[PDB]
Amino acid sequence: TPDVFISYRRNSGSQLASLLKVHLQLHGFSVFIDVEKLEAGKFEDKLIQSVMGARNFVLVLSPGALDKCMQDHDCKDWVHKEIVTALSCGKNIVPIIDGFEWPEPQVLPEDMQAVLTFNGIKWSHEYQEATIEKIIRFLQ
Amino acid sequence: TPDVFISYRRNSGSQLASLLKVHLQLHGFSVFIDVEKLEAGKFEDKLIQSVMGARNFVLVLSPGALDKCMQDHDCKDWVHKEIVTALSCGKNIVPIIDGFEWPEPQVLPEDMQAVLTFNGIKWSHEYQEATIEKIIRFLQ
């Protein structure tokens, strides 16, 4: 059972999410990222189960990463779904900010507005080792 | 003296460049990337010497990565200068393609058109371990 789930937006956060996975694994964490560990079966169920299994929920906030959550009242966007699961389960949520513009909470669906109240970590290209160190400090 | 120099465009390939650095270091290669190894002094001298010192020249071709070299006739662009140094020294050049559109040689400065004759490796987000294994096979 992975200790860390990485939630990310494919068109903008795939490289940072993979970088996070490598570093966190190096430091002994079991990491779930879809390209490595999502296997056979119905992916909606499997992805929600993988969020529930992981104590830590790492959210890659690349530019525009929550755009597709906006107006997603039916909760059909996969990132929206992962965030709501992490919130409902009381996970240790750790946003990673990489060029992200913080939206006002009221443009997001009410069931995920609480994600903006968690302390985030700013990915520093120039100080990557220290960024990783900070993430590890935040993980449980 | 590091075995691998990583040349990349900061605005678009920083994440992939750092992902490549970590993976290659984990496989025992000594890697030069500016944010970790460029130290004090006049940076234009140091970066040229660093290209000269590394047997392998890993070129991160993220989207539009050569745009700033086009019509850079006085060769003031840093990626342009790094490529020219790699070609001039006959380094083992290994282009990494990630959403890159191959330009026609006419649009590039004459002293770097030869970079388009080297066999490149396509970055696959879904098959990253295989991509890394292929890069390692290309390295000397």
Curated annotation (Swiss-Prot), chains A, B:
Q: What is the effect of changing residue 69 to A?
A: Abolished NAD(+) hydrolase activity
Name the source organism. Answer: Homo sapiens
Q: What is the effect of changing residue 82 to K?
A: Loss of NAD(+) hydrolase activity
Summarize the impact of residue 72 to K. Does not affect ability to promote axonal degeneration following injury
Q: What induces it?
A: Up-regulated by lipopolysaccharides (LPS).
Partners and quaternary state? Homooctamer; forms an octameric ring via SAM domains. Interacts with TICAM1/TRIF and thereby interferes with TICAM1/TRIF function. Interacts with MAPK10/JNK3 and SDC2 (via cytoplasmic domain).
Q: Which family does it belong to?
A: Belongs to the SARM1 family.
Q: What does this protein do?
A: NAD(+) hydrolase, which plays a key role in axonal degeneration following injury by regulating NAD(+) metabolism. Acts as a negative regulator of MYD88- and TRIF-dependent toll-like receptor signaling pathway by promoting Wallerian degeneration, an injury-induced form of programmed subcellular death which involves degeneration of an axon distal to the injury site.
Show where the TIR domain sits: 1-140
**Binding-site list for NAD(+) 2:** 9-10, 39
Q: Which residues of the full protein are shown?
A: 561 to 700 of 724
Effect seen on changing residue 36 to K:
Loss of NAD(+) hydrolase activity. Abolished ability to promote axonal degeneration following injury
Record remark: domains: The TIR domain mediates NAD(+) hydrolase (NADase) activity. Self-association of TIR domains is required for NADase activity.
Intrachain disulfide bonds: none
- Could you tell me in which tissues this protein is expressed? Predominantly expressed in brain, kidney and liver. Expressed at lower level in placenta.
Name of this chain's protein: NAD(+) hydrolase SARM1
Substituting residue 34 to A results in: Reduced NAD(+) hydrolase activity
From what superkingdom does this record's organism come? Eukaryota
Where can this protein be found?
Answer: Cytoplasm; Cell projection, Axon; Cell projection, Dendrite; Synapse
The active site is formed by 82
